Homo-oligomer: A and B are copies of this chain.
Amino acid sequence: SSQVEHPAGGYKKLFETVEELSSPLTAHVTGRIPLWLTGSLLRCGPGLFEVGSEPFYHLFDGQALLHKFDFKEGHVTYHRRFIRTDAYVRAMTEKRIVITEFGTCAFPEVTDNALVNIYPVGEDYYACTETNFITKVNPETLETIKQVDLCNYVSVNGATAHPHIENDGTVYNIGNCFIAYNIVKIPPLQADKEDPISKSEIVVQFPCSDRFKPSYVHSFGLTPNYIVFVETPVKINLFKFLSSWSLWGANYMDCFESNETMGVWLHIADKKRKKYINNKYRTSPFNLFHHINTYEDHEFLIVDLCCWKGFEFVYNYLYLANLRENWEEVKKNARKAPQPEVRRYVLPLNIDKADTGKNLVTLPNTTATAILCSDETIWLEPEVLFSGPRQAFEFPQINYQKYGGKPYTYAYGLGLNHFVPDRLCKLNVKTKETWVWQEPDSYPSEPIFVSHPDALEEDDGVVLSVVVSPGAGQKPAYLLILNAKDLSEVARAEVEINIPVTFHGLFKKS
């Protein structure tokens, strides 16, 4: 949990327009930047929160800004450029809001505002949002290369900002199809050197709980042998979605509703046999954005999730007007929102009818349960790993390359305090011990883990976070490097300009 209030309102700087740079700045280092840290931290976020006098309304509406911190020989640079999307380019051309964003209807066509994340496919990097358009970008210059329409290649209406990436470069993602949820597989770059997106395929399909209302989907789980998909009660109303949007004046946010009675349905597919498995896993209602990690342990799937307890769409609390309120009002507004909680669910793969009415979760080191009912639904209860009053352990990251999809012990996260990011966290998922890093009037980003090259242990490395530190006596922002063992500070690299909120990203080793 956080141990801090924010009466000064410095968090408002997360949602304030900035300018791009024409070339990299030097970042003033204090402490010691590890000499083995060589490469680029690449992150996305909104950077332009109004076009002239026309305002963007929602957290996810501001125009995509691609950020880069470079690390070489203990020295750091910072650079940023707006992504030249249709949304941005046409807004600059016409000097108004042209494309409808998530929560901002444009007055008189799908957004490609790639403000959320960035990931590799073959030798390329793509910025994304959650729509059918991803944007190829140059990871060294931050130039925008190409718009790619996933619909030209596979049958999906969108795809998440959280694809899983296997060690050979294979990319998996999930997307709505208008009804199913399709898993897309993009193969690694092959000898022929042609673009791996042109070899995309749907490998497996998950069914939908309601023919006319698909669930919103933000991420999914992957193990060597299984794919896990969590169907939440946040639904997309397709009657509102597929009508004339500039008639009645709609945006994406206007098309969501909550199903009060379904709870959550969890789904598994066989990854290698490409086959949906018909186990009716059921539990109580929550929103889910980020899976932490998933793994196989005997005949069981361990599914670790950042949950929000309730069926109301958490995105309702993320209009900019609310996030720009003063501290007492920010807290008041979040009182009735769903409560964040890290939960471990355990999914049995061997369902014996003879165990009807009992708990199937026979593993020795969890309190998670799974009850086989007579209708063959399997009712799940979680083991809670972390729970704090409006204190979210969010934007989770692990040592992904070596532990993604596998037995693991540690996760790192961004700590939200009534939705305001004010700390960095580490959770031991076996023991539930936590570690916190926190300074007054400091607003960090998702922490990203980078392994030490001679690491023996899961947490032998650092985490990198971009921190916004407003109010003079300090420089506006900095790159924070923390030791992954105990979250003690190793270094920081201060810059002379503001940085707004960023959502996701990656470290690119060079």
The residues of B that contact A474 with a CB separation of less than 8 Å are none
Q: Whole-angstrom distance between the alpha carbons of A373 and B259 in the complex?
A: 10
Q: Mark A468-484, 1 if CB is under 8 A from B, else 0.
A: 00000000000000000
What is the interface size of chain A, counting residues whose CB is below 8 A from a CB of the partner? 41
Q: Is A271 an interface residue (CB 8 A)?
A: no
Q: Is A138 an interface residue (CB 8 A)?
A: no
Which listed residue (B309, B337, B388) contacts A381, Cβ 8 A?
B309
A310 contacts B367, CB within 8 Å?
A: no
Q: Whole-angstrom distance between the alpha carbons of A358 and B334 in the complex?
A: 11
B365 contacts A389, CB within 8 Å?
A: yes
Q: Whole-angstrom distance between the alpha carbons of A55 and B359 in the complex?
A: 30
A309 contacts B369, CB within 8 Å?
A: yes
Q: Whole-angstrom distance between the alpha carbons of A304 and B49 in the complex?
A: 46
Known: A366-B389, A373-B260. A284 touches B379 (CB 8 A): yes
A387 contacts B379, CB within 8 Å?
A: no
A312 contacts B388, CB within 8 Å?
A: no
The residues of B that contact A337 with a CB separation of less than 8 Å are 358-359
Q: Is A70 an interface residue (CB 8 A)?
A: no
Known: A258-B357, A357-B312. A362 touches B335 (CB 8 A): yes
Q: Is A341 an interface residue (CB 8 A)?
A: yes
A312 contacts B365, CB within 8 Å?
A: no
B312 contacts A338, CB within 8 Å?
A: no
The residues of B that contact A258 with a CB separation of less than 8 Å are 357
A367 contacts B389, CB within 8 Å?
A: yes
The residues of B that contact A388 with a CB separation of less than 8 Å are 367
Known: A369-B310, A384-B384. A357 touches B389 (CB 8 A): no
Q: Is A339 an interface residue (CB 8 A)?
A: yes
Q: Is A360 an interface residue (CB 8 A)?
A: yes
Q: A285-B371, A311-B371, A364-B389 are in contact. List 16 more A-B contacts (CB 8 A).
A: A258-B357, A260-B373, A260-B374, A260-B375, A284-B284, A284-B381, A285-B379, A309-B359, A309-B367, A310-B371, A310-B381, A312-B358, A312-B359, A335-B362, A383-B387, A384-B384
A residues with a Cβ closer than 8 A to B are 258, 260-261, 283-285, 309-312, 335-341, 355, 357-362, 364-369, 371, 373-375, 379, 381, 383-384, 387-389
For this complex, 14 residue pairs linking A to B, each with C-beta atoms less than 8 Å apart, are A284-B284, A285-B379, A310-B358, A311-B371, A312-B357, A312-B359, A336-B360, A336-B362, A339-B367, A339-B369, A339-B381, A366-B389, A367-B387, A367-B388
